[PDB]
A = this chain, B = another copy of it.
Amino acid sequence: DIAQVQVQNKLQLAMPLLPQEVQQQGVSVEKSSSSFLMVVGVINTDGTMTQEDISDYVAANMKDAISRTSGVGDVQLFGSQYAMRIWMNPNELNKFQLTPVDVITAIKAQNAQVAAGQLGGTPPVKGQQLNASIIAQTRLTSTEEFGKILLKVNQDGSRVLLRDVAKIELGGENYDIIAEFNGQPASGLGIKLATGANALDTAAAIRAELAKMEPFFPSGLKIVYPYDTTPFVKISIHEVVKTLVEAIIL
């Protein structure tokens, strides 16, 4: 921490020396351990899901709590979170005379979350009866929805849509990463012990956290524990206290 502080202190000096997006992207200082405590793997055994199906359910339903878990100083996903994949067909743009700018700029319109205030809110007029929260545009949770985002129209209204050129579907943030488990499609977590914890304890709360999650797992979803350091340290200590005993007798 103190280390974290002096570092945090000097680092401030160089943020203004950063190109902006780095700053906007943000710069984190984190007590690090390059060796994950364990790895917990996952599959769907009825096959009813894919590795992306598993990929995302993880990140959303698990990681952050896995992240917030006591003793977890870092998690690393194997997988990716769904993020809407809009697939741009250039030739169909030009067909429609359009550009990714055309396809972005409107995204900000549809998938917007707007703050509209209220009816008769403060400061009101006296005798006011009703006060209410206006609701302006909201986020678009689904493929269909972005698709109906509107690039533009005409005075006549002819509708040039987001999807009015290219497809759209969910997908991992990156397709960069893949895990298989025993050759079975897989998504998993890099699991780092936060510096300072008893790992015997962490992992158990980790398993604990899982016995928590399991009731809510979808059908055929399965956990596997591909990598762990605890079973070793378990026997090691035992192996040792064993020696203690004989030492007593001899």
Contact = CB atoms under 8 A, between A and B. Distances in A.
A176 B13 contact: no
Contact of A9 (B25, B29, B123, B171): B29
Chain A binding site: helix, strand, loop or mixed by DSSP?
helix
A28 B9 contact: yes
Interface string A1-31: 1101110111011111000010111101100
Contacts of A4: 5-6
Contacts of A123: 171, 175
A115 interface: yes
Contact of A2 (B1, B12, B26, B171): B1
Contacts of A176: 122
**Best-surrounded residue of A5, A9, A28 (most CB of chain B within 10 A):** A9
A21 B115 contact: yes
B23 A122 contact: no
A174 interface: yes
Nearest to A16: B24
Contacts of A21: 115
Contact of A26 (B8, B16, B26, B115): B16
A66 to B, nearest CB: 16
Given A175-B123, A176-B122, A16 B5 contact: no
Contact of A174 (B2, B16, B122): B122
Nearest to A10: B28
B13 A28 contact: yes
Nearest to A24: B16
Interface in A151-196: 171, 174-176
26 contacts: A1-B2, A1-B5, A1-B6, A4-B5, A4-B6, A5-B5, A5-B8, A8-B9, A9-B28, A9-B29, A10-B28, A12-B26, A13-B26, A13-B28, A14-B26, A15-B26, A16-B23, A16-B24, A16-B25, A16-B26, A21-B115, A122-B174, A122-B175, A122-B176, A123-B171, A123-B175
Given A9-B29, A12-B26, A14-B26, 15 more contacts: A1-B2, A1-B5, A1-B6, A4-B5, A9-B28, A13-B26, A13-B28, A15-B26, A16-B25, A21-B115, A122-B174, A122-B175, A122-B176, A123-B171, A123-B175
